[PDB]
Symmetry: D3
């Protein structure tokens, strides 16, 4: 957490408000931001100053997507693949099964690549004024990285295809309708609502909370006979490590 | 199989088998005894000509308060491992193994409290009509346990990842209208109209061809993990099997 | 495209209005229509006069499902070939069509019509449209690929309710359960559908085709595999553009 | 109380023998019900820590009963079909104790499912295997088609399903149907030595390990690592 | 009227011969279209109840035509050409209405692995030379060759020959489960004809249902496969 | 320090360097081996990596003292140490940017199976001893060992050696598909070098794309694999 340039961490009574911090660039996710975000999230897993992580963006943006210059334009094949993997290293590899509960607080512009860490977070609270967009089609690219998969994970096929194919923007209430976020409230109540939800998660047994939210995503592709076998081993693991 | 029941009641009604958990003093908590009796009841009703549809509900003010904290959890905590496994299997033996592909159509009538383990038989049933006043809750997190058995899988089967994680992680209660919005139940109506609405839907299912109704509702849950090429092959055999056994 | 007997095709500023043309039979899908529809869909994938295809029904019916007279009632391998020819255009060709597809449900949509409706990329229904999985009322299961198609876009509760009950529902209910993207009054159906088609026509056609395919491809994949596939898909997109 | 099954206890080994030699150990609804009772009773019988499945006489099992199971209502037929698979693979494939199939002779049709659902299998060289269902005008129903595909390659599975051609114990070993094939005179002792080897292991760890192998097969590597981490913790918490 | 494929009928056996010996039976877009028409014509031709796929001359097939298929286009046209190959190589062949046997009489390289593996069975000559030689030409085993080899061979053997491009004979192909049997070339035709006659003696409806069910149940869990096999058995008895 | 790296005309001989501990994989070695693999995938002096062990061992498995006993630690720390093992043993190795060959020169037990199987190819010495000895130590084959064995071995062979913990040599490892080839130890180094030189003669881009494509298409249906392989082939030509 020392010498961060693109990421801000503010601790608040057990809550780690992690803000993408490139407001002048609308929090576009560059290779520098990708490296810092993984370093922050890895450190916060063992930082006792927090038991829940809130992911948001500084200024009027959640995130305008990947940096069109520093991530896309300025990027050898193996060198290119390493930078692409560094994005997914924190956007979904670390976030999807994160050690502590995660809440995405969408305060504003959320486009393209921003959908992957938003969906990899366990919960999401958006502002009514927040503007979501799968604008990749308008920039001549598909929703790569894991954006296409992430949208398919939480939204129905009809809604996923409509916003990928058309690139049409939509607000927080529409994001809640299609299952992209858990709740949409006015921006003036966004932080208060997200903080109340984080405080509710802080009141739970942290081990049981971690085991339960992981098991939900693990059992998704399993058959019912396999899920019962996994959940039984997961329940015994929970009581053994608490 | 229907005689000497201590925790479950069965009442026949014009081709409907109203199966209600019968431990109201315990809010219909599901004990190992109840898990054993319900499997007996559901197995017998699959061949009982007095029914063409099964309605699963609870006596009193509770649909179910989840697994018995005393008889299912506490009294089996220090039991031998294979004994605990057998008790756990017996719960899922009727909660999802029997219910999810029951030979007859099943409707879950959520008349009241529905917590924790009660979500698995509720979701394993084909259709679900809840009361607006009913209170749902994945309160396992507040008791220090994960939603085990098959509760976690059952919730992810009908509810989106956001709604599934929200109520699993927060343990927050919600009513029948929220259960309908998140896809947990088909319909939500006031409690005063819950039985008449459930009975009307049950009579609608009774008016259908029972063989085709059984075959079609099973095929829906079978084809979900299949690719479209495999599902077309399975639906072709399922359609031929339907015509041969009708 | 020449000599068609059950399908009509009208070109409109890059839009291929493909209508099932059996209105006196409520656009029931016969083995003849199944053969012609695949014949038309294969030709339109390379027809430079179209960049988007709108599937709709002539008259008051989008489609009344499979032809109860020419398809169902009328050898095992012969029966299998006729059944396969239905899915050949209803999902095999439509689900990963080389061009964007929009289903315009102008009226009756029952049984087997669900498969090409769901295999299309997008769907705009009329509020007055009447959907229904009435196969249970006819004594059959939603065969072909209907059960899978309904499973693909609707939640398990909604899918089971309409399959088991055979209850009909309107355009707004179809939009609510995720069967279609939007639902407008019939008087505004063609204008809204043409507006959506022009929006798709303004996109990069190669990127649009690759993106709509990638969405349906990554669904059964794990996140590690989908990231690998999307990286290869993104590279294929830039190379063939 | 059993009429179709014989159980012999030997130093922690429960020798479970199919006992219908007059019908070549064909599996009837009576045998299917009796076998589930035996397996359910043996999983808590402390007198055994390993179960060996074999057949009395010159047969392992000639498949399902052509008369009782097949020739003799829709949901009644489905119940009898489910009773066969209830013990043939639902109970056996994840049985609480290690299981060994000892193929002493004829092994045809439906016999493949309990043979494959068992953890391990030792065959006699003189034993004759055969997916002869095609010769009787039926497909390998129940779960035989799935069971054969689980242990043998697609080529070997298709060859013996489509041709109905018999093969011996050495061929069964080569295609992976059984772990080992020895002469019949050495079959029981080789099986008993393997059963004794399994009895020397930690029973909890052995049950957990053998279950974990079959569970992780359809998992991706990221998910299997998560499953194996919980399975190992579950192992240490109950041992 | 066919130019690249030859069809000879023999007592219910349709000997289908790839016929481009001057190009070592390389598969061109012309051959790909002709093979699909032959397969679509033979599935209802009562002169055959079994299909034997092989190659004329000293070749089975040297893979895809390096000139006509790869070297000699717009994106959708190249995809249509690519789709036409898989249309007969695996889409039609993998679930073909009639039993299929691949007779590997000679060279079998690259893209030839897909129709070889999509056929139900395969008998090779010991002298036949196999090879996933795409790596030697600077391309991955595209089409469905990578999946086909993954379907019948273990991961070690699949990776070894994909990565090394090293050739191997008929006995090695039998060892790794690529073919069911390998015999001397002088005995290949009679050994293949005997297997074809063995398939012709089966109930053709039951044979088609069983060979399809084997490949359908591969990715199913055991509970789902039992559900599918019960429906497949009822469909078999009805048709 | 715990790893040795020797460059040889494009070959990166990567040796586990804890011979006094039989190359037991400590948390120290786990972190160091990941850095070596990360450094080599961008080191232009190598186009192939051979993973072997110093001394008489390939690897005796995980360090019983430093990896297991000394982590007896809070749950998240234990999970972090466990994840660091799989970070290089399969997360980095299974889809490594360059071809990998495991040279099993000696003892290969327990956790050593995971990096052995995550390597693309493997050549063993006949004299080398292989063992899934976890059952003898009271633990299940955790990490990804159970999944790795199931990935390359049949269910029977996987279950036999997990349940019995029985040791086996290089020829048996080749017979069950654990390694590609087994030769006498005196010929092991040159046989592995021939394979490494063969891999070095291939287009490294096409070789990486092809070897990755094989493992990616395993769980796909044939229609999905064809779509993936077409994009993979286009990605190959563009890169
Ligand atoms: C997010 C957005 C609506 C904000 O609107 P705005 O308040 O008017 O701010 P601006 O459009 O003027 O851009 C703000 C700055 O941040 C940069 N910026 C915005 N989004 C960026 C992105 N993905 N990548 C890199 N830079 C970005 C701009 O280049 C600009 O830089 P500059 O001030 O040095 O010239 C608008 O910037 C936008 O549409 N960005 C692209 C969103 C997107 O489509 N992402 C997916 C790309 S595939
Ligand atoms: C369902 C509930 C809201 C009803 O509240 P109520 O009407 O006021 O009734 P009570 O709380 O007084 O409980 C009545 C009886 O039923 C028992 N009971 C209720 N739920 C029970 C359960 N899962 N298991 C065992 N007993 C239960 C009570 O212990 C009590 O028994 P007692 O009278 O002998 O003391 C309440 O019982 C409850 O909060 N929780 C259990 C629900 C739950 O969270 N289950 C999952 C736990 S993992
Ligand atoms: C679609 C429907 C609501 C239209 O009702 P309508 O305007 O009153 O039209 P009609 O019912 O009078 O029938 C119109 C004609 O189209 C035919 N038709 C309608 N649906 C048909 C279908 N699936 N298959 C074959 N013919 C059909 C009728 O047989 C009739 O032919 P005819 O006039 O030459 O005798 C009506 O046909 C219906 O109730 N059901 C359609 C069938 C259906 O549900 N199919 C899925 C079944 S598996
Ligand atoms: C196993 C077999 C090779 C033994 O040959 P054998 O020593 O000559 O024994 P036989 O066939 O002469 O007779 C054995 C008795 O057991 C019965 N039997 C053998 N297999 C049987 C089976 N699946 N089901 C019912 N009865 C069977 C015979 O009907 C016969 O009864 P009977 O003596 O009262 O007339 C031979 O019996 C056989 O082929 N059985 C069928 C194997 C098979 O195909 N199973 C799959 C069926 S789909
Ligand atoms: C099959 C093979 C071993 C036989 O070699 P041979 O008997 O000595 O005879 P040739 O090598 O001269 O080949 C004979 C003709 O068929 C052609 N031929 C062989 N394989 C061909 C292929 N895939 N595509 C197109 N033409 C091919 C040759 O170009 C040659 O053409 P020509 O006679 O007009 O000059 C050799 O031709 C060969 O290696 N072919 C390539 C196999 C392969 O790698 N396929 C995968 C390609 S990615
Ligand atoms: C590999 C093996 C057969 C070699 O036998 P050996 O040549 O006679 O060598 P030794 O047993 O005498 O031990 C050599 C050293 O290496 C260590 N060693 C060997 N395997 C080790 C392992 N997994 N972990 C930690 N140390 C190990 C010994 O503790 C010993 O250290 P020390 O000399 O400081 O006391 C033997 O070490 C063995 O049987 N098992 C090691 C672990 C194993 O087999 N499986 C993993 C258990 S889960």
């Amino acid at each position: 957490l020392n010498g961060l340039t693109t990421v801000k961490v503010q601790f608040d009574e057990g809550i780690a408000w992690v803000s993408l911090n490139r407001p002048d660039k609308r929090n576009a996710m560059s290779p520098t931001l990708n490296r810092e975000m993984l370093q922050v999230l890895e450190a916060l897993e063992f930082d006792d100053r927090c038991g829940v992580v809130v992911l948001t963006g500084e200024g009027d943006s959640f995130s305008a997507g990947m940096d069109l210059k520093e991530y896309f334009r300025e990027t050898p094949a193996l060198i290119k693949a390493q930078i692409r993997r560094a994005a997914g290293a924190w956007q979904w590899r670390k976030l999807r099964f994160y050690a502590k509960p995660t809440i995405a607080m969408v305060n504003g512009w959320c486009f393209g690549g921003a959908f992957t860490p938003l969906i990899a977070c366990d919960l999401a609270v958006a502002a009514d004024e927040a503007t979501f967009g799968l604008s990749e089609i308008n920039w001549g690219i598909i929703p790569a990285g894991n954006v296409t998969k992430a949208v398919s994970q939480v939204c129905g096929e009809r809604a996923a295809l409509y916003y990928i194919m058309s690139g049409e923007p939509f607000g927080g209430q529409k994001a809640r309708e299609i299952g992209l976020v858990n709740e949409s409230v006015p921006l003036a109540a966004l932080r208060e609502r997200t903080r109340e939800l984080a405080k509710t998660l802080l009141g739970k047994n942290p081990t049981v909370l971690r085991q339960a939210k992981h098991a939900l995503r693990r059992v998704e592709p399993m058959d019912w006979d396999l899920s019962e076998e996994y959940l039984a081993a997961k329940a015994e693991q929970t009581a053994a490590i608490d």
